[PDB]
Amino acid sequence: PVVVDIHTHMYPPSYIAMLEKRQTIPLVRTFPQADEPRLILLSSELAALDAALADPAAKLPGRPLSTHFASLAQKMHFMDTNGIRVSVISLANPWFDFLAPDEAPGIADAVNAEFSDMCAQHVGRLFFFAALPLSAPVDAVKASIERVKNLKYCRGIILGTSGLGKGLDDPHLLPVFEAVADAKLLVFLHPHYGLPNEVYGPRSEEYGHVLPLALGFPMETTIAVARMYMAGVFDHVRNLQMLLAHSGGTLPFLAGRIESCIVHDGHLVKTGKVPKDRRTIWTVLKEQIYLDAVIYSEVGLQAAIASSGADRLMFGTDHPFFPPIEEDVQGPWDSSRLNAQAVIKAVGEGSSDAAAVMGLNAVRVLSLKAELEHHHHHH
């Protein structure tokens, strides 16, 4: 059975161009010590950036801009060495959120075209989620949607939790959700903004990137989806299908708590917001939500499976964000293996559930089957 990675990223070289053109986060800079640039994407990296700008003895800010971000060859090598047959690549955070409304559409258009072209270089092994110019007007976002649905190898949309600027429960965003759903594009929801840095306290710099990445990201996703659900987006756009990064952040773990808090909320109940025919978060989880398996443990994975069903979980690696630190970056990646291992421990090696999670769900849901059969036969 085929192995598909649905959570895996690239920054096209032209996108990288923009990042070193930038004076504020997100940005890429080169520092005296290493000829390997620094990728500075997150609010949490700001304090260390200012410290490294005013002090050469201070630690390097952000993360290393490796060749694994921009090189298609590196991507294919990674896939070969980790037993991945197919990747559905996507532009990584922060996408186009920082662009002015007038320029975003044209930049998104070019970058999406680049991804299509990259996928064409290895027919049958590469597909992509397109990024949208969500800092631009809604009409431009719709036009961009119509365009990407007709790009070769596009199998959905990646979007962040800020939406148009006011999150995913913004009613102005409803027509974007409708446009994407009607175009039968899967929506891959992905974190970036995390939580305000103050929540991590005054010693946060001592803990590296662990708190914003281990906690901020999945909590952001949970909050964004909970907001969507509460505003009734899933009911208003019944054909919408969303894939959630990091097994829904914390959603499978908190779904019961969310439900109990809703049914026990005085204000909601007494103002008619909790009717008897109400679709529960569990229903939405079985009907409109898919979860990636980037969860690193059979503990989280089993919760995700129990929440959405084994036919709705999809393997991913988050390549290239977690390289081995002291092991060979050209060898197998622990960050990939940990997830595959979680799958095996949870549902058993060789099982049909394993096959489903590791690739077959993605094949079915993203309609990769005809491409795959062709390739295996004709290629």
Ligand X SMILES: O=c1cc[nH]c(=O)[nH]1
Cα–Cα distance measured from residue 187 to residue 161, given in angstroms and rounded to the nearest whole number: 12
Cα–Cα distance measured from residue 358 to residue 260, given in angstroms and rounded to the nearest whole number: 33
Q: Which of 91, 87, 149, 133 shows the shortest CA–CA distance to 115?
A: 91
> Applying CB under 5 A, which of residues 292, 318, 353, 371 lies at the interface with Zn ion?
318
> Binding partner of residue 276 among ligand X, a second copy, Zn ion, none, CB under 5 to 8 Å per kind?
none
Cα–Cα distance measured from residue 239 to residue 234, given in angstroms and rounded to the nearest whole number: 8
Contact letters (x/-) for a second copy, 234-273, by CB under 8 A? Answer: ------------xx--x-xxxxxxxxxxxxxxxxxxx--x
Q: Which of 150, 162, 71 shows the shortest CA–CA distance to 112?
A: 150
Query: Is 318 a known ligand-binding residue?
Result: yes
Residue 120: exposure state from Cβ atoms within 10 A (0-12, 13-18, ≥19):
exposed
**Cβ of residue 245: shortest distance to Zn ion, in angstroms?**
6
**Cβ of residue 93: shortest distance to ligand X, in angstroms?**
5
**Cβ of residue 325: shortest distance to Zn ion, in angstroms?**
18
Which residues 173-212 are close enough to bind a second copy by CB under 8 A? Answer: 195-196, 198-203, 206-211
Query: Is 209 a known ligand-binding residue?
Result: no
Q: With binding defined as CB under 8 A, does residue 275 bind a second copy?
A: no
**What angle do the packed helices 334-347 and 298-308 form, to 10 degrees?**
60
> Applying CB under 6 A, which of residues 44, 82, 93, 161 lies at the interface with ligand X?
93
In this structure, are residues 266 and 314 in contact, taking their beta carbons and an 8 Å threshold?
A: no
Q: With binding defined as CB under 8 A, does residue 66 bind a second copy?
A: no
Contact letters (x/-) for a second copy, 277-316, by CB under 8 A? Answer: ------------------xxxxxx-xx--xx---------
Which residues 312-341 are close enough to bind ligand X by CB under 6 A? Answer: 318, 321
**Cβ of residue 9: shortest distance to Zn ion, in angstroms?**
6
Q: Please tell me whether the peptide bond between 26 and the residue prior to it is cis, using omega within 30 degrees of 0.
A: yes
Cα–Cα distance measured from residue 357 to residue 354, given in angstroms and rounded to the nearest whole number: 5
Contact letters (x/-) for a second copy, 130-169, by CB under 8 A? Answer: ------------------------------------xx-x
Give the DSSP H or E segment for 91.
strand 86-91
Which residues 36-55 are close enough to bind ligand X by CB under 6 A? Answer: 41
In this structure, are residues 7 and 292 in contact, taking their beta carbons and an 8 Å threshold?
A: yes
Q: Where are the alpha helices (DSSP H) in 212-292?
A: 217-230, 233-236, 251-263, 266-270, 281-287
**Cβ of residue 321: shortest distance to a second copy, in angstroms?**
9
Which residues 97-136 are close enough to bind a second copy by CB under 8 A? Answer: none
Residue number, 139 or 259, with CB nearest to a second copy = 259
User: How is residue 357 annotated by DSSP?
Assistant: I
Q: With binding defined as CB under 8 A, does residue 44 bind a second copy?
A: no
Q: Which residues contact ligand X by CB under 6 A?
A: 9, 41, 92-93, 213, 318, 321
Contacts to Zn ion by CB under 5 A:
318
